[PDB]
Amino acid sequence: MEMEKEFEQIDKSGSWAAIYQDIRHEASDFPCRVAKLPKNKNRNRYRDVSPFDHSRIKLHQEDNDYINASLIKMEEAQRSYILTQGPLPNTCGHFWEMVWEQKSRGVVMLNRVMEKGSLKCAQYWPQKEEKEMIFEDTNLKLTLISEDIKSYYTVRQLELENLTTQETREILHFHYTTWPDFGVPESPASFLNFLFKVRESGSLSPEHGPVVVHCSAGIGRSGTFCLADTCLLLMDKRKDPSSVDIKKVLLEMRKFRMGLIQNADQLRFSYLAVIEGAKFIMGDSSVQDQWKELSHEDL
């Protein structure tokens, strides 16, 4: 449409690396003082990835309100996301406290628990119906209710209970399981199929708290997911696949959490996804069915 004009110009020039570096240079820099406090060192998975103070999610907790998570509030698009690191063995209780307090309906997980032979995330949800999890520190109970395993992703229905009030909520867990260890999944199709499954579930809707999105660090895959969703939403709202400037949207997002989109491959993939998703937005409803086919979710 026009981002596709730029896309081809950048591809012709082989200048993705440089484009991406420009983003790094212009991106916001805000303080992360709370994240860096000594009492919080064991709450951070990576020393170089911290939430800004101004946008961090606070736990409604006495003693220590810290979790490595940022509220990304997209004003024009009217969508908010919580991006967070993959929970640590000691922060799983905090993670579910956050989901409860922020009134989230959905959790989007873009990594596997083990990648490249090391642990990228704690096993923070129950794998079997009959073996529920209790997080004593935050007094929450979590039960697997059902799971639908597809080829490239798994959807789980979970029930989260506040053990204090005995109130319960249904949380949907959307787990993209096939993001490759190294090089972006060059199928915008399965990624889009997945994004549209999350949308269809109601998890992204204004009547719920912000969706929680994470990978290992909560910036790369997570950034791609949110950037694509927001760009498509903007194009939808304006119905104009030309006014939407992806680099501009990415810079706006980076006001709320550092380092979103971790390399030139992920940036180029973000363009691809938005360009392809635009077909649906602009009236070609049959493409969603085409993605589902291309995204052989049955094997």
One-letter-per-residue 3-state SS of the chain: CCHHHHHHHHHHHCCHHHHHHHHHHHCCCCCCCCCCCHHHHHHCCCCCCCCCCCCEEECCCCCCCEEEEEEEEECCCCEEEEEECCCCCCCHHHHHHHHHHCCECEEEECCCCEECCEECCCCCCCCCCCCCEEECCCCEEEEEEEEEECCCEEEEEEEEEECCCCEEEEEEEEEECCCCCCCCCCCHHHHHHHHHHHHHCCCCCCCCECEEEECCCCCCHHHHHHHHHHHHHHHHHHCCCCCCCHHHHHHHHCCCCCCCCCCHHHHHHHHHHHHHHHHHHCCCCCHHHHHHHHCCCCC
* 181 annotated ligand-binding residue: yes
* Long-range contacts of the stretch 25-31 (C-beta < 8 A, 24+): 26/251, 27/251, 27/254, 27/258, 27/259, 28/251, 28/254, 28/255, 28/258, 29/258, 30/54, 30/55, 30/255
Rounded Cα gap, residues 82 and 260, in angstroms: 13
Per-residue CA distances from 35 to 16, 29, 175, 240 (Å): 32, 14, 27, 40
**Gaps after residue numbers in the chain (C–N over 2.5 angstroms):** none
Assess contact for 271 and 47: CB atoms under 8 A.
no
* 219 annotated ligand-binding residue: yes
Rounded Cα gap, residues 89 and 85, in angstroms: 12
Rounded Cα gap, residues 52 and 192, in angstroms: 29
Cβ neighbours for 130, distance < 8 A, ≥ 6 positions apart: none
* 215 annotated ligand-binding residue: yes
Measured in degrees and rounded to the nearest 5, phi and psi for residue 64 equal: -140, 110
* 216 annotated ligand-binding residue: yes
Rounded Cα gap, residues 103 and 267, in angstroms: 31
Assess contact for 216 and 246: CB atoms under 8 A.
no
* 220 annotated ligand-binding residue: yes
Nearest of 290, 268, 299, 296 to residue 6 by alpha carbon: 268
Catalytic residue among 32, 121, 215, 231: 215
* 218 annotated ligand-binding residue: yes
Pairing label, strands 167-176, 153-162: antiparallel
Rounded Cα gap, residues 179 and 53, in angstroms: 30
List the Cα angle 69/254/80 in 5-degree steps: 55
List the Cα angle 250/253/256 in 5-degree steps: 150
Assess contact for 6 and 267: CB atoms under 8 A.
no
Active site residue 32: no
CATH H-level, domain 1-299: superfamily: Protein tyrosine phosphatase superfamily (3.90.190.10)
Per-residue CA distances from 10 to 132, 188, 217, 220, 234 (Å): 50, 18, 28, 21, 23
Domain boundaries, the chain: 1-299
* 24 annotated ligand-binding residue: no
Nearest of 121, 115, 123, 156 to residue 46 by alpha carbon: 121
Residues in the chain: 299
Q: How was this structure determined?
A: X-ray
Assess contact for 10 and 16: CB atoms under 8 A.
yes
Rounded Cα gap, residues 132 and 145, in angstroms: 10
